[PDB]
Amino acid sequence: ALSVHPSIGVARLGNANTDNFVLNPMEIGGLPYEHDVDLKPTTTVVNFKDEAGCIRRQGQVFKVFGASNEELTLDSPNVKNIEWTVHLANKKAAWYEFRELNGNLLYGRDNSYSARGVPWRNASKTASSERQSLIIDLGPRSVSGVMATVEISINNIPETYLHPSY
C-alpha cells in the first residue's frame, strides 16, 4: 500500500552553480519553483539563468505515502527514518545507433535490432567487458536524514559497487 510519487521523476540539465537550482513544476504546463532554505517550494521561477547566463538545474521532489493516502515524513509519529537509494546511469554509448523505427518490437519480431541489422555505437568494441565499460555508471547513492547532500560523483563510488565506468 506504501506509494512513492511521482512514479517517474523528471530533472533537467543545468549549467549554473551546483547549489543554484529550482524545483519540479507542480502541474502540466506549469512553471518550475523557487525554493526556501528548507528546500520547500515558494514562488514560481523568476529567472531560468543566473547573472552569468548559465541555466539553473531543475530538481525533482519525491514524496512517500502510506496507510490511507497520507504523506509520510521524518516528522511523523510512527516514522523513525526514511532512506532513498537512487541509481542513475547512461548506456547511450553502449547501445545501437538510432535508425528511426528500427529496433521497435511493436512492429513485430521482424522489426528487431538484429533482424534489421542495426549497427552498435562504437562498433570497434566487440567483447561484452569492453561494451560494459562504455556505460557511465557510478553505482547507487543512498540519502537519508534532514538537509542531506550526496553527489553521484567519481570518488564517491562505494567499495560495494565493483564495476563502475565513466
From Swiss-Prot:
Record key words, sorted: Antibiotic, Antimicrobial, CTQ, Oxidoreductase, Quinone, Secreted, Thioether bond
GO molecular function: L-lysine 6-oxidase activity; quinone binding
GO biological process: defense response to bacterium; killing of cells of another organism; negative regulation of single-species biofilm formation
Subcellular location: Secreted
UniProt KW Secreted keyword: yes
Post-translational modification: The cysteine tryptophylquinone (CTQ) is generated by oxidation of the indole ring of a tryptophan residue to form tryptophylquinone, followed by covalent cross-linking with a cysteine residue.
Highest taxon of the lineage: Bacteria
Induction entry: Forms part of an operon with lodB.
Misc. comment: The intracellular stability of LodA is dependent on the presence of LodB protein.
Known role: Has antibacterial activity against a wide spectrum of Gram-positive and Gram-negative bacteria including nosocomial isolates of S.aureus and Pseudomonas sp. The antimicrobial activity is due to hydrogen peroxide generated by its lysine oxidase activity. Also has autotoxic activity. Involved in biofilm differentiation; responsible for cell death within microcolonies during biofilm development which is linked to the generation of a phenotypically diverse dispersal population and thus may play a role in colonization.
Name under which the protein is recorded: L-lysine 6-oxidase
Species of origin: Marinomonas mediterranea (strain ATCC 700492 / JCM 21426 / NBRC 103028 / MMB-1)
Name of the encoding gene: lodA
